[PDB]
């Protein structure tokens, strides 16, 4: 009867959006890496892949679930950020945690949807 426990789902992702909507201070101390900024620009990579419009951060430090020490909702409870590097557009690098929560990666090109993915797009 673990449904009574799950039925009461503690939505931390939605709670963070409300906290920011209430003028809350974004989570700090996301670990920004030094890199060439000549990378592929993909969202989540084994090594920093920031291009000139992005900052690369240690993944675990940008994961709400890792930082708040709460279960991951991802399949089998695995983290998609821990042990990897997340590229965040420079315009949103002030809140990497909120960016990874509000955005999703394209399974085809590996780019963020709305910030690099051009799959939904002539003269050769």
């Amino acid at each position: 009867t673990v449904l009574s426990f799950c039925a009461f789902a503690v939505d931390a992702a939605k709670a963070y959006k409300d906290y920011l909507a209430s003028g809350g201070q974004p989570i700090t101390n996301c670990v920004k890496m030094l890199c060439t900024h000549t990378g592929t620009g993909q969202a989540i990579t084994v090594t920093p892949e920031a291009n000139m419009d992005q900052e690369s951060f240690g993944g675990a430090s940008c994961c709400l679930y890792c930082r708040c020490h709460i279960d991951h909702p991802n399949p089998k409870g695995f983290c998609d950020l821990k042990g990897k590097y997340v590229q965040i557009p420079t315009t949103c690098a002030n809140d990497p945690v909120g960016f990874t929560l509000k955005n999703t990666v394209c399974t085809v090109c590996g780019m963020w949807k709305g910030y690099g993915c051009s799959c939904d797009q002539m003269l050769q």
Binding site: L34, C35, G58, G59, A60, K82, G83, K84
Partner: protein, 299 residues
């Protein structure tokens, strides 16, 4: 030298290791000055980047499926900036374990929380990094004596768990040091004390042991060697510099595919020691890596 500012840091010149200096107070002309760090870069991302840039110039053994353990990886902010740099530096697939007395979240493959003395493993390691510092070291109560605490654990861990050919980088300061650790530097083909340019205003240095031989090639008196280290820091002023942080194109550790082989202390002849000394061989088994942290149970 004006040339020091263009490097990631400064290694202690060999002539200092051969002196017999008296221990004195460490007095840096720029003590406590802040480095000008690139925008949004934490002190320890800058510091570990310079340590890794310097380790790139040494004969580190780099086998496929390398094993690295990082002690003192946690910070007062609950994240592990040093571990993130090590993971960026090390070859993809390197097994990286980190540990700290206090809770933190990291990019390591496994993290152990608790005193390093509670950490166990029957496996050998290729590289040991320690950034441990005991907060009580800031309360100078008994002169500048050799310290115990985690240093006794790291000396035992190096002698029991470091693969022959393996290397170490152990953080020391004017007051955070151990005589047995300096003596153990004589068990490597080569060693030095390295100061990062972003922390030139600190007595901090990394004692780097390159290519573990498992036997003393040079007898070192630890009390005298720490005095020689402080004499170097007192007479060679190092200016703060963040210059090396701006060129990252050659940062990742080169994949050498260093040979790994299993040998008994009876087969370690002079030809094998010659390969170990050149960074061309790692001696250990390739069994699965198993680690544990002892938990004290109280009623």
């Amino acid at each position: 030298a004006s040339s020091q500012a263009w490097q990631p840091g400064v290694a202690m010149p060999n002539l200092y290791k051969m002196q017999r200096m008296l221990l004195e107070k460490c007095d840096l002309q720029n003590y406590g000055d802040s480095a000008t760090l690139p925008k949004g870069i934490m002190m320890n991302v800058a510091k570990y980047t310079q340590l890794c840039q310097y380790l790139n110039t040494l004969t580190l053994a780099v086998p496929y499926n390398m094993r690295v353990i990082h002690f003192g990886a946690g910070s007062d902010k609950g994240v592990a900036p040093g571990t993130a740099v090590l993971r960026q530096w090390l070859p993809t697939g390197t097994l990286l374990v980190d540990s700290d007395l206090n809770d933190f979240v990291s990019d390591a493959d496994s993290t152990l929380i608790g005193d390093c003395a509670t950490v166990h493993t029957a496996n050998k390691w290729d590289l040991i990094i320690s950034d441990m510092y005991d907060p009580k070291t800031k309360n100078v109560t008994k002169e500048n004596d050799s310290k115990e605490g985690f240093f006794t654990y790291i000396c035992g861990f190096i002698q029991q768990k470091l693969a022959l050919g393996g290397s170490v980088a152990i953080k020391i300061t004017e007051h955070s040091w151990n005589a047995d650790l300096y003596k153990l530097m004589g068990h490597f083909a080569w060693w030095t004390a390295f100061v990062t340019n972003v922390n030139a205003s600190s007595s901090e240095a990394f004692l780097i042991g390159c290519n573990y031989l498992g036997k003393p090639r040079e007898q070192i008196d630890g009390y005298v060697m720490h005095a020689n280290y402080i004499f170097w820091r007192n007479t060679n002023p190092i200016q703060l510099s963040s210059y090396s942080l701006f060129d990252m194109s050659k940062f990742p550790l080169k994949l050498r595919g260093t040979a790994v082989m299993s040998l008994k202390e009876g087969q370690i002849n002079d030809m094998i020691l010659s390969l170990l000394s050149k960074g061309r061989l790692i001696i250990r088994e390739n069994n699965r890596v198993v680690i544990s942290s002892d938990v004290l149970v109280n009623n």
